[PDB]
Structure 1
């Protein structure tokens, strides 16, 4: 495949988020570190096995890709309500 799969991605379904709290990975190999107010792209809401998980894989401003607890972030809403 490609970095983001094989089929086309609809840019309208791409979600963004802002970290609500600082976060230090308990697992430095699977997770990413966050500072309150960081923005990121939500790449997937499934674990490595393909299961629905409360840990979401994201891509931070740094370019780092790892998981973060869903309740530690805020999905930016449409138009302006961030």
Structure 2
């Protein structure tokens, strides 16, 4: 699902996160920055798990409550 890069939101890791499922989730260290690509799940459903792109370049899902949106 597309979007205007220009209203893109960024986030910061509040805590370390270890992927229980490396195929669907990405790792985070407190403090890391990432771009929120989508807040839906792989099925377009609302989700407490969001798809993001981190600094190292990995794409995947992280727990919404482990991050803070920068505004």
* CA displacement at 1:11 relative to structure 2: 3.4
Q: Which moved more, 1:10-19 or 1:41-50?
A: 10-19
Counterpart for residue 33 of structure 1: 27
Counterpart for residue 49 of structure 1: 43
Distance 1:26-1:11 versus aligned 2 partners, 3 A rule: same
Runs of 4+ in 1 over 3 A off after TM superposition: none
Counterpart for residue 4 of structure 2: 10
RMSD, aligned CA: 1.6
Aligned residue pairs: how many? 70
Higher strand share: 2
Q: TM-score, normalised by structure 2?
A: 0.91
* CA displacement at 1:13 relative to structure 2: 1.3
Distance 1:46-1:38 versus aligned 2 partners, 3 A rule: same
Distance (Å, rounded) in 2 between the aligned partners of 1:57 and 1:43: 5
* CA displacement at 1:51 relative to structure 2: 0.4
Unpaired runs of 5+ residues, structure 1, are 1-6, 77-82
Q: TM-score, normalised by structure 1?
A: 0.80
Q: Secondary structure at the match of 1:71?
A: helix
Distance (Å, rounded) in 2 between the aligned partners of 1:24 and 1:38: 13
